[PDB]
C-alpha positions as a printed Julia matrix, in Angstrom:
154×3 Matrix{Float64}:
 -46.2   101.89  19.33
 -46.93   98.03  18.34
 -48.97   94.94  18.73
 -48.82   91.1   18.66
 -50.01   90.63  14.87
 -51.15   87.19  15.92
 -54.22   85.53  14.89
 -56.65   86.35  18.14
 -60.17   84.66  18.24
 -63.28   85.81  19.9
 -66.12   84.0   20.7
 -69.66   84.66  20.34
 -73.09   83.65  21.52
 -75.48   82.46  18.78
 -76.62   82.88  16.72
 -75.35   86.16  16.43
 -72.17   84.61  16.38
 -72.78   83.06  13.0
 -74.7    86.26  12.2
 -71.74   87.94  12.41
 -69.37   85.2   10.11
 -72.32   84.89   7.29
 -72.63   88.96   7.25
 -75.68   90.33   9.27
 -74.06   90.89  13.0
 -71.18   94.07  11.99
 -71.1    94.86  15.59
 -69.28   92.42  18.59
 -71.38   93.58  22.17
 -68.68   92.86  25.58
 -68.23   94.88  28.57
 -64.58   94.72  28.07
 -62.57   96.89  25.64
 -60.0    95.74  23.12
 -57.68   98.14  21.35
 -57.2    95.16  19.01
 -57.44   96.4   15.13
 -57.2    94.04  12.52
 -58.05   90.76  12.17
 -60.3    88.72  14.39
 -61.53   84.63  14.12
 -65.23   84.18  15.18
 -65.83   81.0   17.53
 -69.75   80.0   17.92
 -69.42   79.42  21.81
 -70.93   76.09  23.35
 -74.72   77.84  24.1
 -76.72   77.02  22.0
 -78.9    79.99  19.72
 -82.71   79.52  21.04
 -85.96   79.35  18.15
 -86.99   82.91  19.62
 -83.32   84.98  19.76
 -83.26   83.44  15.82
 -86.99   83.98  14.48
 -87.03   87.56  16.17
 -83.11   88.32  15.45
 -84.24   87.0   11.23
 -86.52   89.77  11.4
 -85.04   92.41  13.15
 -82.04   92.34  11.35
 -83.81   91.45   8.16
 -85.5    95.31   8.53
 -82.26   96.8    9.71
 -80.45   95.16   6.78
 -82.84   94.04   4.31
 -85.34   91.57   4.12
 -82.76   90.63   1.39
 -80.39   88.97   4.17
 -78.72   85.91   4.59
 -78.71   83.23   7.22
 -77.41   80.23   8.43
 -79.15   76.52   8.25
 -77.7    75.45  11.93
 -76.08   76.85  14.56
 -72.82   74.93  15.76
 -71.61   74.86  19.19
 -67.74   74.86  20.32
 -65.95   74.95  16.74
 -64.37   77.85  14.94
 -66.48   79.4   12.18
 -65.07   82.35  10.2
 -63.4    85.63  11.27
 -64.34   89.23  11.32
 -62.02   92.75  11.01
 -61.8    94.76  13.68
 -62.02   98.19  12.84
 -62.62  100.25  15.74
 -64.71   99.24  19.2
 -67.26  102.2   20.41
 -69.0   102.36  22.68
 -72.5   102.94  23.72
 -72.03  106.18  23.47
 -70.11  106.74  20.43
 -71.07  103.46  18.59
 -74.49  104.9   18.33
 -73.15  108.52  17.69
 -70.57  107.73  14.58
 -72.92  104.37  13.64
 -76.47  105.72  15.12
 -77.56  102.78  12.3
 -76.66   99.96  14.66
 -76.67  101.28  17.96
 -79.09   99.12  18.91
 -77.53   96.58  17.09
 -75.22   95.82  20.49
 -76.49   96.47  23.93
 -73.06   96.11  25.74
 -71.43   98.9   26.79
 -68.17   98.44  24.08
 -69.24   97.08  20.99
 -66.35   95.98  18.12
 -66.87   97.28  14.73
 -66.16   94.3   12.75
 -66.53   94.06   8.41
 -65.41   91.38   5.78
 -67.26   88.69   7.81
 -66.54   85.41   6.07
 -67.43   81.84   7.08
 -64.76   79.56   6.86
 -65.38   76.03   5.24
 -64.39   73.72   8.0
 -64.99   74.18  11.86
 -61.98   73.05  14.4
 -63.26   71.65  17.85
 -62.38   75.1   19.86
 -63.73   76.14  22.72
 -64.7    79.95  23.4
 -64.51   82.35  25.87
 -66.05   85.49  26.98
 -62.72   87.06  26.18
 -60.3    87.2   23.37
 -57.85   84.25  23.83
 -54.89   83.19  20.91
 -55.88   80.34  19.04
 -53.95   77.19  18.44
 -50.52   76.85  16.72
 -52.28   74.3   14.87
 -56.04   75.49  14.36
 -54.58   79.43  13.61
 -52.79   77.78  10.38
 -55.79   75.13   9.45
 -58.16   78.74   9.89
 -56.41   80.56   7.55
 -57.14   77.68   4.85
 -60.79   77.3    5.62
 -61.19   80.71   3.65
 -60.2    78.71   0.18
 -64.15   78.36  -0.56
 -67.04   80.03   0.35
 -71.02   79.78   0.15
 -73.23   80.16  -3.1
 -74.67   83.35  -1.57
 -71.39   85.48  -1.09
């Protein structure tokens, strides 16, 4: 019937986190389901991406989307990167069923399909969480502003 059209933010574990707002990860892995459909800000958790996951994922995705993929210069932590439009959230079953091309991209039971990945120009000192949490009134705006400019790639 109705839902809070507020700017929510879902933290992610790098590098994936960045890969999302970058345009490589069009899906999110979570052990829970979120009927939230619309805009969802992606933030990089406090965890740091290992040199094994980045190097591996870099080559892994390169063959999943194309060696001509993109990749960030670094991977920050505890800051808002960008945002992704959550189209739908399928499960290990539906996800692959409909999106069998990215059935491996995620392992979680409930995959959150996102699109229009954009990385904000300015990051804010925020804390991530394994679940969905309403952004800070002050952050909401700033985040909407950081979308004034993008990298040279896009």
